[PDB]
Structures are given as structure tokens and as C-alpha cells.
Amino acid sequence: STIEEQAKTFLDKFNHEAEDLFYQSSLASWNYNTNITEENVQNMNNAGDKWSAFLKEQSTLAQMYPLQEIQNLTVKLQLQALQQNGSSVLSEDKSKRLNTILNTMSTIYSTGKVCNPDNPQECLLLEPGLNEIMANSLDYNERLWAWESWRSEVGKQLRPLYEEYVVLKNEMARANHYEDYGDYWRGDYEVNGVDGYDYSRGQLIEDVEHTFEEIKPLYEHLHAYVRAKLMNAYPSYISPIGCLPAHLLGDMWGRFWTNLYSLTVPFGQKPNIDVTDAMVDQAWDAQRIFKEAEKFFVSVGLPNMTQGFWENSMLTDPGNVQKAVCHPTAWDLGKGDFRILMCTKVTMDDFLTAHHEMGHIQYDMAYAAQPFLLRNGANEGFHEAVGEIMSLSAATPKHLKSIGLLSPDFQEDNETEINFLLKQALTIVGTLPFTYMLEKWRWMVFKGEIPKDQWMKKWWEMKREIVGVVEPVPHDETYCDPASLFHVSNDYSFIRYYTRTLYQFQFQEALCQAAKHEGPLHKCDISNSTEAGQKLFNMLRLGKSEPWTLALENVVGAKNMNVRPLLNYFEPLFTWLKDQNKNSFVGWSTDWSPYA
Amino acid sequence: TNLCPFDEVFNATRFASVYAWNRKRISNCVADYSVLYNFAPFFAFKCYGVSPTKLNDLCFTNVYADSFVIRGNEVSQIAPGQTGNIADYNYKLPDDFTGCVIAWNSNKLDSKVGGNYNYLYRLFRKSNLKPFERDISTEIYQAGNKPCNGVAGFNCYFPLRSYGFRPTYGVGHQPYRVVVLSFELLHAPATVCGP
Ligand SMILES: *[C@@H]1O[C@H](CO)[C@@H](O)[C@H](O)[C@H]1NC(C)=O
Ligand SMILES: *[C@@H]1O[C@H](CO)[C@@H](O)[C@H](O)[C@H]1NC(C)=O
Ligand SMILES: *[C@@H]1O[C@H](CO)[C@@H](O)[C@H](O)[C@H]1NC(C)=O
Ligand SMILES: *[C@@H]1O[C@H](CO)[C@@H](O)[C@H](O)[C@H]1NC(C)=O
Ligand SMILES: *[C@@H]1O[C@H](CO)[C@@H](O)[C@H](O)[C@H]1NC(C)=O
Ligand SMILES: *[C@@H]1O[C@H](CO)[C@@H](O)[C@H](O)[C@H]1NC(C)=O
Ligand SMILES: *[C@@H]1O[C@H](CO)[C@@H](O)[C@H](O)[C@H]1NC(C)=O
Ligand SMILES: [Zn+2]
Numbered sequence: 001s002t003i004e005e006q007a008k009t010f011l012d013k014f015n016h017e018a019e020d021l022f023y024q025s026s027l028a029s030w031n032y033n034t035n036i037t038e039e040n041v042q043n044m045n046n047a048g049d050k051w052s053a054f055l056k057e058q059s060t061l062a063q064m065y066p067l068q069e070i071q072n073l074t075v076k077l078q079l080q081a082l083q084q085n086g087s088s089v090l091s092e093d094k095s096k097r098l099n100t101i102l103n104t105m106s107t108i109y110s111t112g113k114v115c116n117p118d119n120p121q122e123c124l125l126l127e128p129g130l131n132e133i134m135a136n137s138l139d140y141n142e143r144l145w146a147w148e149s150w151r152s153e154v155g156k157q158l159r160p161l162y163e164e165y166v167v168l169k170n171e172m173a174r175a176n177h178y179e180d181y182g183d184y185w186r187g188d189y190e191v192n193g194v195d196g197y198d199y200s201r202g203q204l205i206e207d208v209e210h211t212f213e214e215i216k217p218l219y220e221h222l223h224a225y226v227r228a229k230l231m232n233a234y235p236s237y238i239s240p241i242g243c244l245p246a247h248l249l250g251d252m253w254g255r256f257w258t259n260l261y262s263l264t265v266p267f268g269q270k271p272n273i274d275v276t277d278a279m280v281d282q283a284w285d286a287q288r289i290f291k292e293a294e295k296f297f298v299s300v301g302l303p304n305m306t307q308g309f310w311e312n313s314m315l316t317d318p319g320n321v322q323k324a325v326c327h328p329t330a331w332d333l334g335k336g337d338f339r340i341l342m343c344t345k346v347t348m349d350d351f352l353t354a355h356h357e358m359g360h361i362q363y364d365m366a367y368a369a370q371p372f373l374l375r376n377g378a379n380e381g382f383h384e385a386v387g388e389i390m391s392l393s394a395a396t397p398k399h400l401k402s403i404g405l406l407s408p409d410f411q412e413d414n415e416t417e418i419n420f421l422l423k424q425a426l427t428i429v430g431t432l433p434f435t436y437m438l439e440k441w442r443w444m445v446f447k448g449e450i451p452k453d454q455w456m457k458k459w460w461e462m463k464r465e466i467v468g469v470v471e472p473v474p475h476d477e478t479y480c481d482p483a484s485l486f487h488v489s490n491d492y493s494f495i496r497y498y499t500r501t502l503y504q505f506q507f508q509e510a511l512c513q514a515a516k517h518e519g520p521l522h523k524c525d526i527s528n529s530t531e532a533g534q535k536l537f538n539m540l541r542l543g544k545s546e547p548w549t550l551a552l553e554n555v556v557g558a559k560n561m562n563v564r565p566l567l568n569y570f571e572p573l574f575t576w577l578k579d580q581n582k583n584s585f586v587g588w589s590t591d592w593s594p595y596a
Numbered sequence: 597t598n599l600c601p602f603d604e605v606f607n608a609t610r611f612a613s614v615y616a617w618n619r620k621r622i623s624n625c626v627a628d629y630s631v632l633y634n635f636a637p638f639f640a641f642k643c644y645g646v647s648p649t650k651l652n653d654l655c656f657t658n659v660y661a662d663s664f665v666i667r668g669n670e671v672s673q674i675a676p677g678q679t680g681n682i683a684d685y686n687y688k689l690p691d692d693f694t695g696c697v698i699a700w701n702s703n704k705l706d707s708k709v710g711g712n713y714n715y716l717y718r719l720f721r722k723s724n725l726k727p728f729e730r731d732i733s734t735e736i737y738q739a740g741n742k743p744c745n746g747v748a749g750f751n752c753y754f755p756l757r758s759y760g761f762r763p764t765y766g767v768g769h770q771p772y773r774v775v776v777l778s779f780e781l782l783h784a785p786a787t788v789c790g791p
Binding site: 001005006009012013016020023027061064306308312333335336337338 | 720766
């Protein structure tokens, strides 16, 4: 028998036992998440240990089948999933050190406390606390104190742990035949062997740079608008030809600009569209919200939800003595068990979150027939994009008027469309330069283009050039400001957000074109359109079986990520901003500093 | 008179595994095909080569009733001319098949919290089965070019593997009990007829 014939038998056996072990692990984790108790932690440790072990033994066994002797490109993907070791290639003396470094560097982040000045007894922690001041206060000095306290007494403790993290993971990177840890991260987007659909690892940097070059002007105009409306609020602290101080952007790190609507609203006399009081005045509940979401999905063309979803799934906070997490998640336990845990309330935000998680569940249901190792999204940005387009389409005034929440007499005026577009832009357009800058900095640090003694100096000059944000106080080579974020201190990738943002609008434009919608793109609903549902399902069915280029081509018609639909979404806002910015300066100079 | 024992086949407390399917010969009795309908959801009640309505009009010499428990999504594999895993290594029907196939859900009986590991099915086999044949031998499957010597390991697998039914699994993974009714005409007087 050939080596390709032997591989299929091993894969069948692996799938059979993997499904059962994974279901046990997921059920234990769910039982703990819906019921906090020490016995549940004990249950959740044993199942995890058994799974991780199993997987290690199978990975060890799957390396006696040479790769250059299998020619189906479907066995090849599963063997590539099993064969990767990654972290076990290092010797035992360094594997323990890496785990200790990661655990300690995570503990320093979670257990963090900025003791305020004078009074020493009072001290404040992130989460409830040093996040409320940055999101709601309006005093320059208070915000600067919070910013600098967090930067100084959480980052210096993490600098001489990241300094070893970098080398100890670069060693693992070239121990698995790579060039650095950045290439290891970028390897998700790599496709080899399928003619007309190859995507190399290095093409991602070029694609990101070329998309940002087109995004830039809209960001510049939004930046100018915010600078004007923000210099209005702070009498004389912001120069009119310079950058923006980093401690007054609405959140600690400036990741989202959404906490500026109260200061940058276009027309402050016209309120937004909130239907919470209407829902309350009709005796709504959780079941009604989820049946409306299911009704929308069935109207599009996708199937209903299984009886298990309605029996074994917790939609309301249990209350009483039971304590459970209330972070909305969508669970795919396997073997036909799909559940949603969400502590929902009667609110429009919960109404949209229901659609988001409902789309997660639908996408999970779509590829249930694929092999075990191919039951995931094509890349790391498709799943959340599919989740987000549903919430995009479910918040339009037309859809709300269809379901009775919004009265028919409501008239869409142009003064509210601009408000909605600005509120959306403060969250979508704002985060893209931040994400791009952070990924480029991490890639250069891992590669070796940034010497060990120029970290912060390079970081802040990039921060000035790309994002237009300037620090209020000077930082030497002792702080570790980028480590101040969950994702840098806990080893997660960050380009997934950029890719998801650019994918969701491509999907939305394709679906709206399939639905014969006329007018602006932001007023589009894909309800009552079976063509759009079929076009979407054609890609949801594939999973990881096909390259993500082909999956994108199935829906959009192109083999690469494109940043024209997003600009088409924000055309009225761009015209309005150009009209409003005819007496100011668009752009910033990287010389002015609030500390002079 | 004398009423064939269909309620020892459709109502037993324990069914057999797929690879050890029970076959019961029914002869020398009057069979009414009407207590059979007094179930409920009959997920599948397909009849091949025989009219279900005109069923109480034809006489046969032997009637065979097979019993086993399979998964929900494998019911479609019990039909003449199907390829897969159950119909190649566990239970295969001839192309010129006369009879009926009946299936129904048994989640409330054959499923327990923790895992009902009492149901097995063969997954490895050198060659396909001939129609109406069973194999209950447990020897290690040699998937490689080296002798196995009766020990499980590399390129050596145990041919049987359990189902593990839990009460929260989906419809496609829930237990289903299947009874197959077979008929034949031989060179003997037909001693099986309806009332
Ligand atoms: C939560 O755990 C407690 C103690 O283990 C148990 O008594 C209770 O029944 C559990 N709740 C549910 C819904 O299973
Ligand atoms: C790859 O293997 C699958 C079975 O898992 C088979 O259906 C498919 O035809 C194979 N590919 C080719 C090109 O034959
Ligand atoms: C680790 O990975 C390398 C390259 O993939 C491989 O050659 C090696 O055998 C693996 N080690 C084990 C035992 O997992
Ligand atoms: C469920 O799905 C079927 C098939 O699409 C449809 O006819 C039915 O109206 C849906 N509604 C229910 C009852 O879930
Ligand atoms: C709405 O349109 C009218 C007519 O063109 C214009 O005068 C008005 O300024 C517009 N309002 C907004 C908010 O664009
Ligand atoms: C979808 O079609 C149904 C039936 O024609 C209708 O009741 C509903 O209002 C439609 N929804 C939208 C958003 O047009
Ligand atoms: C199965 O046995 C139970 C036990 O009395 C009886 O109630 C039921 O009617 C029987 N069903 C059939 C189809 O014989
Ligand atoms: Zn989500």
C-alpha cells in the first residue's frame, strides 16, 4: 500500500477519537462557564489535560508520513495541521522558562493598580476604574496623571520580560524553519500548490501598505474635524497645525475614538434612532429578540435553529445564587450541539448582539460536514466579518419599520444620516492606523530592524507619522508602552481586525448588488432576498477546504482584499467633511510637542 | 389465530450492535402488518418491491426481521445500491431486494448522560461484504506492509469503535433503531399470510 493510502486510515481514526474528546472538553467548559464552582474547575482541568495530551501523541505519530509523497491537497492540509509542533521544539530548560515568562507577564497585566497621589491608601485598578476616568473625565491633568501612571508603573515591570520573550520565541521560530515570529504569525494567509490562487507570506505587508495608502485621505479629514471640535473643548492645549495628545482620545490606548460623540456630534439638536423605549412599551423579552433574529435569517434563506438551541441554551442571567460569566459567546460543541450564552436585556445593543452571535452560529452550522481539522473559517478575519454584516443590515431604519419598532410616520432626514455615519467612522476608520502601526512595529522588532536601544524612539516617531498622535511627556528607553495592551502582553495577533474591517464591506456590497438595491450603500437591507443568501452560503459551506482567495472570489469576484467598498460606504461623510474643512488645515506636522 | 411475534422485535428492551445484527426467522404463523403502524414518527418507512397497502394480500414462505441500532445520518445507507461505511463493512442489502425498511428515534432509551458505550461498529475491513453477511471477528487491521503480530500500534488498529450516545447530541447523531423486514418465495407452500 502507498503512503497516501496509509495516511487516510490514520486521519479517519484521528477524526473519530478527536470528535469525542473535543465534545467532552467543550461540555466541561460550558458547565463551568454557566456554573462557577471548584468542582467544575476540576472537571475542566481533567478534560483539557486529556485533550492536550491526545493531541500531542497524535502530532508525534503523524510525522512518519513524508509530505512529498501525498498528492491530494486535502490530506495535505490535515497533515500540516497535525504535524506543527511549534513550542515543543525547544529543549526542556527553555520551554519551562517560556511558560513562566508568559504567566508572570500576564499576571503583572491583570493584577495592576495605580495608586493615586497624596492619599496612599486609595488606589485604582483597570477594568472598573482607570477606564472610567479616561472614558468620562474632562480634565486634562487627571487624564495625564492616569495615562502616565499606567505607562510608568505597569510597563517598566514588563520591559525586561519582553526583552527575553522576543529572543526566546525567535529561537523557536527558526527552530520550525521560519525567519522570525512575524512570519510564523503571517503564515495563516499563506497558500501553496493551487494554481492561480497562491498567496505568499510577504505579500501581506505590501497589500496592507497599498490599502492604507488609499484609506489615508478620509482619515486625514476626520482627524482635522476632530482636532477642530476638540481644540474647541480644551481652551488652549492643542495646536491647530499639529498632532493630538495621546491621553485625551477617549480610551487609554486610543484604540477606538467612539468616546468622542458628545464632543464631535454634527447636529446636536437631532437625536439618534433608539428603539429601547418602544421595545419596553410592548412587553418584549429574550425569546422575542431571538425569534426576530431567526426570522430574519430564515427570510434571507438560511435554515432555522435546532431544538437544542432552544432547550439547552441560557439566554437570561440566572440570578439568585448561581454566578456565571456574561460575555456573549457562540458555542459549537460538536456533534450537532449549538448553543449561545449571553446575559441579554431589553436594549437595542442586545438586539444587534443577538444578530451577531446568531450569524456566528449559522456560519458554524454551515461547515458541519467538513472533516474535523477543516472546521473553521477560511482565515482569521472571515468569521467576525460574517458576524458583523448581519448587525450592519439589522440596524437600518427600514428593517426597524418592517418589524414595528419604528413608527411608519418616521421620516429619514439628511441631518441624521451624517450623525450615524460619523458615529460609525469614529469606531471603524479610527482603529485602522492604530492596528497598522502596531503590527508594523512588532514585525520590525521581531525581524531585527529595530535595535534593542531604539524601541520607544522608533515607536513614537511612527506614532507621530502614521496616526498623528503625540505624547505629552518624553519617554526614554525604560518604558514599555506597547506592552500596556491585552494583546501585546498575552501573545495574540492584531492584523485580524484590519482584514475583517476590509472584508465586511466587500461582502456587504456584493450582497447588496445581488439584492437589486438602489441608492446609498449604508441604507441597504438584505432581507427577503434568497439570491444573497445563496451567494453567501456558497462560501459558508467550504470551511478551510479551499484557499481563502477562492472563498473570497466566490462572493465578491476578486482574489485579493480591496478598500474601495469601504470608501463607497463613507462617501456622504467625505463630502460633508470636505465642505466643513474649507477654512482649516488638513494634515499634521511632526514637530510640535506639548512638552516642547 | 396464532399471531406472529412482531412485538418481540419492535419492543425489545435491548437491541443489538450493527456488526452483530440479530436475524429472526418467522414462519408458520399468521402475520398482520397493522400493529406495526401503531408506532408514531416512523422517520423512514420505505418499501422496495412490495406495496405497503396491498401488503395484507400476498403470501410468502419466509419472513426475516433484522435489528440493529445506528446513527441518525446513517439511515440513508440502508437501501439497495448505496456506498459508505455501514453499507460496506457492517450491513449490505442485495440490489434485487424485496422488503421494507423501518426506522425511528430512540433518544429517550439508548442514550445516557456520560456515554452509552455499549454500541459498536466496524470501521476497518480489507474487502466489502457480500449481501446479508456478518463478521464478528476482532483481529488487528494491517494497514501497512509489515506483519502486525497481534499488537495495536503503528499501522495496526482495532477494527471496532464505539458510538458514545449522549442526550444533548443533535438529530443526526442521536440513536435510531432500525428493523428490516425481508420476504422470499421458495419451492415450498407459502405458510405466511395475512388475515
Ligand atoms: C450549579 O451547581 C450546583 C452545585 O454544583 C448545582 O446544585 C446546580 O444544580 C447547578 N445548576 C445547574 C443549572 O445545573
Ligand atoms: C482526496 O480525497 C478525498 C477523500 O477524502 C476524495 O473524495 C477526493 O476525490 C480526493 N481528491 C482527488 C483529486 O481525487
Ligand atoms: C517538530 O517539528 C519539526 C519540523 O516540523 C519536525 O521535524 C520534528 O520531528 C517535530 N518534532 C516532534 C517530535 O514533534
Ligand atoms: C423552519 O424551516 C422550514 C424550512 O425552511 C420552514 O418551512 C419553516 O417555516 C421554518 N419555521 C419553523 C417552524 O421553524
Ligand atoms: C439636507 O439637504 C438640504 C437641501 O440640499 C440642505 O440645505 C441641508 O443642509 C442638508 N442637511 C444636511 C445635514 O446635510
Ligand atoms: C419581507 O416579506 C414579508 C412578506 O412579504 C413582509 O411581511 C416583510 O415586511 C418583508 N420585510 C421587509 C424588510 O421588507
Ligand atoms: C411495547 O410494550 C409496552 C409495555 O406494555 C406496551 O405498552 C406497548 O404498547 C408495546 N408496543 C408495541 C408496539 O407492542
Ligand atoms: Zn462576534
